[PDB]
Design a protein around this ligand. Structure first.
Ligand SMILES: CCN1CCc2c(N)cccc2C1
Length: 150
């Protein structure tokens, strides 16, 4: 009963979250997960400002409307040498990572550690926030509000 949530630096309030280091989040769960961080799924605009603040990943994730990978440096194995916000057009499958957006975040680069999931509710799961620099916060809770995701 244990979930790792892997989080990135927030850029203009937009961060990256992987569940258990693999693509295993539905669109419904993307909403619930972000809402546990007191966040909403980003709009394209919020993501485009996130990107200009110096944000990139090598992983597909949900935003408001699409599944995307933000890209600064052209790389062959990430979104296929594309730069800017790369939109996934064709895919058989539903589960990816997610992006979230906290409006309370600093306006640019925020590479401080995330030490809480301030709005998770009561549950039996161990939920471990896992940071890029390795630091951890664990709490017993739940965030999934749709049974089809549990
Ligand atoms: C699998 C690549 N991801 C990269 C993202 C990430 C983060 N953000 C935090 C901890 C581990 C990881 C690993």
């Amino acid at each position: 009963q244990q979930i790792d949530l892997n989080v990135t630096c927030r850029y203009a309030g937009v961060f990256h979250v992987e569940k258990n280091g693999r693509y295993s989040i539905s669109r419904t769960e993307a909403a619930d997960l972000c809402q546990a961080f007191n966040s909403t799924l980003p709009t394209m605009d919020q993501m485009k400002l996130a990107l200009s603040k110096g944000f990139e990943t090598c992983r597909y994730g949900f935003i408001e409307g699409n599944v995307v990978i933000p890209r600064i440096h052209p790389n062959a194995i990430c979104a296929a040498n594309h730069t800017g916000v790369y939109i996934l057009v064709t895919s058989n499958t539903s589960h990816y990572d997610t992006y979230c957006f906290n409006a309370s975040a600093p306006p640019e680069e925020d590479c401080t550690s995330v030490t809480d999931l301030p709005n998770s509710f009561d549950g039996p799961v161990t939920i471990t926030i896992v940071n890029r620099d390795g630091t951890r916060a664990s709490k017993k809770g739940e965030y999934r509000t749709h049974q089809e995701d549990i």
